[PDB]
Point group: D2
Chain length 86, copies 4
C-alpha cells in the first residue's frame, strides 16, 4: 500500500498551475514510492497538501506556498525518512 | 455526482509530462464539475484514463495519446453529453 | 555550432498556453543539450505555429490541428539532427 | 523600452529544473498574456537559475536565495513593465 498524496487548491484563485507543477515535482522525485497524487479543485482560498490524510502543508498555517526542496523534504520525512535527497 | 478521473502513466517511459498536461487541460475545462484528477505512476507502457473507473482512453485500444479536444469531449460525453463546451 | 532557437506561437484567447508550455517541456526534456532555447509567444486569432530558427515545422491549419509528442520530436530531430 | 518585454529563464538542465522553469513561464504568461512579447526557456549548465526581462536580471538563485514564489516573480516583472 503506497502513500497517497492530495493537493486541494482554490480554482478561482488560479492556483491550478502551481498545484499541477507541485504534483509533477512530487512524481518526478517519488515516482516508485507513491501510489498517486490527486489534484482536487477546491474553493475559498484553500491550499492544502496531505500525505494519507496528514497535512504536510496548509497555506494559512504554513504562511504561503512551498518551494520544491521543502515540499520534497516534508514528503520524504513521512514516507522514507532515511532517504538522503542531496 | 462529480466524477473521479485517473490517469495511469508509465513512469519510465517519460510520460509524466503529458499526463500532468492532460490533468491540467481537464481541470482547466471542468474546474468545478470534477471531483479530482489523480496521476498514478505505472509501469510497462501503460497509459490509461478512466472516469469513475470507466476507461475513456487506453494507449493500445485507442492508438496512441489523446488530443485535448477529444479528451475533453470524451469526458463531457460520459458526464453529460448535452453539456455544450463552446470551444 | 550556434544552437537552434525554437519558437511556439499560440493563441492566447483559445487557452492554448497549457498545450504550448507542455510542448516546450517535451522538447527541452528530449533535446535539452542540442537546442538554444524554446520561446513561448502569446499570439492572435487561432494561431498555433512552431518554428526552428524561422523554419516552420508545425502550423495548425496546414498540419490539421496539434502535434502528438512523437511527431513533434521527429520533425525537430529531422531538422536539427 | 517600447517593445513588449522579452522574458528569459535560464535554468540548469542537469539539475532537473526544467519543471520549475516551465511552471514559472506558464505563471507569467497566464497573468500577463499578450502584455509579454515572449518567455524563453534557456537550457543552461552549472547550477544557474536566472530570470531576465529585456536582459535585466530580476532573479538569480545565489543572490536571491533560491527560487521565486509566484507572487514575487510577477511583481518584479510588474515593477519594470
Amino acid at each position: 500500500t503506497k502513500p497517497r498524496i492530495a493537493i486541494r487548491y482554490c480554482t478561482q484563485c488560479n492556483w491550478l498551475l502551481r498545484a499541477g507543477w507541485m504534483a509533477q515535482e512530487i512524481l518526478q522525485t517519488f515516482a516508485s514510492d507513491i501510489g498517486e497524487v490527486s489534484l482536487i479543485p477546491s474553493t475559498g482560498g484553500l491550499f492544502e497538501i496531505t500525505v494519507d490524510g496528514t497535512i504536510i502543508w496548509e497555506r494559512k498555517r504554513d504562511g504561503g506556498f512551498p518551494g520544491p526542496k521543502e515540499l520534497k523534504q516534508r514528503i520524504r520525512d513521512l514516507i522514507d525518512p532515511e532517504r538522503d535527497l542531496g
